[PDB]
Amino acid sequence: DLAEETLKIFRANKFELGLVPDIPPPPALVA
Amino acid sequence: MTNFDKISKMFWHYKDKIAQIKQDIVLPIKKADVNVRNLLSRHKRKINPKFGQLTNSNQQLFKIQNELTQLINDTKGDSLAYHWILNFIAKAVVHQAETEVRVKPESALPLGKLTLYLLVQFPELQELFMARLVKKCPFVIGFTCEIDTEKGRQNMGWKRNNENKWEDNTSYDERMGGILSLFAIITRLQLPQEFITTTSHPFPIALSWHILARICNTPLNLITNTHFVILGSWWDAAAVQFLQAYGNQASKLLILIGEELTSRMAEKKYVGAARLRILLEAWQNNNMESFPEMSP
Ligand code: PRO
């Protein structure tokens, strides 16, 4: 259900104001 | 990204619930019989001192949990009295966050533990408590509106000093920080062993993610010192455990609030922003603090 754009944001080394995913990452996306 | 229409809809849901609490519970009790009002007065003031008797001691925590549960159970048969007392408890817990946690932030730890326990033992309390938190402190769900108009001030939980003078900024900010401190604690505590296999945590760590994300997604023209205050109160209460929960993703979000958000508002010289940057710096220097563990 996670958009590819959200997956890209979780893969990035940073978030940006206005673009933080509202829903926390599942464990698979935490390093 | 955040959909601010849904957060606004969520805000006005809890605001409508506060209004529903007044009509469907408070006035019924005002129009009610005397012998029951006396019993609830005896119960109302037998309950209020318990929250202040909390200490840093787990043994003392368990005592207060037990004594409040017996008093709430005294009303369990009687729906109007039961919901009236839970509304009172929810108000008293928030009031404690506004007053005692404000002066002694670490006191949010025992109070959060007590509240989380009451929230699963008596789950009608969850909606009453969350409605009271959102009404008094809309930051708990990431709601922000302009406070230039009188209506906006009211929505964001400001009180009146008198006729047409708002409460001073320090009073409001310190109340918001104390309330959010308590909620922050609750989101990062684990359920006691008696519930953890049987019950979902009613206000889990995801709700702390929502707060930070939604504030970071809020139009910057609506950010005020209070956002930074509650984020610093949140940090002192839960940053260690937030990192445990979400690791590198938590870290990106802490950097976003502590470096980027403070930088973007730097010319406002918000006192809360300066403190949040100090907390970021302590973490960057491998010196992040947490409230001391409770003693035996
Ligand atoms: O779930 C979706 O529909 C999103 C759209 C872009 C790729 N994944």
Author numbering:
A (entry chain D): 400 to 430
B (entry chain B): 243 to 538
Task: Quote the original article.
At the cytoplasmic face of the NPC, Nxf1•Nxt1-bound mRNPs encounter the cytoplasmic filament nucleoporins Gle1, Nup42, and Nup214, which specifically activate the DEAD-box helicase DDX19 to remove Nxf1•Nxt1 from the mRNP8. DDX19 is a member of the DEAD-box helicase family, which are RNA-dependent ATPases composed of two RecA domains (referred to as DDX19NTD and DDX19CTD throughout the text). Gle1CTD plays an important organizational role by providing spatially separated binding sites for Nup42GBM and the DEAD-box helicase DDX19/scDbp5. A comprehensive structure-function analysis of DDX19 indicates that binding of Gle1CTD•Nup42GBM induces a conformational change in DDX19, thereby stimulating its ATPase activity.
When we recombinantly purified the minimal S. cerevisiae Gle1CTD•Nup42GBM complex, we noticed that the purified complex was more stable than apo Gle1CTD, which typically requires the addition of IP6 in purification buffers for stability. To understand the molecular basis for the interaction between Gle1CTD and Nup42GBM and the resulting stabilization of Gle1CTD, we determined the crystal structure of S. cerevisiae Gle1CTD•Nup42GBM at 1.75 Å resolution. Nup42GBM folds into a compact domain with a hydrophobic core that buries a solvent-exposed hydrophobic surface on Gle1CTD, yielding an interaction interface area of ~835 Å2. Consistent with the extensive interaction surface, the interaction between Gle1CTD and Nup42GBM was robust against several individual alanine substitutions in SEC experiments. Instead, highly disruptive substitutions that introduced negative charge into the hydrophobic core (F414D or F409D/F414D) were required to completely disrupt the interaction between Gle1CTD and Nup42GBM. In agreement with these results, Nup42 variants containing the F414D or F409D/F414D substitutions were unable to rescue Nup42 deletion in S. cerevisiae. Burial of the exposed hydrophobic residues and the thermodynamic favorability of Nup42GBM binding and folding explain the large effect Nup42GBM has on Gle1CTD stability. Our Gle1CTD•Nup42GBM structure reveals that Nup42GBM interacts with Gle1CTD at a surface that is distinct and well separated from the IP6 binding pocket and the Dbp5 interface. However, there were minimal conformational differences in Gle1CTD between our Gle1CTD•Nup42GBM structure and the previously reported structure of Gle1CTD•IP6•Dbp5. Additionally, IP6 bound tightly to S. cerevisiae Gle1CTD•Nup42GBM in isothermal titration calorimetry experiments (ITC) with a dissociation constant (Kd) of ~3 nM.
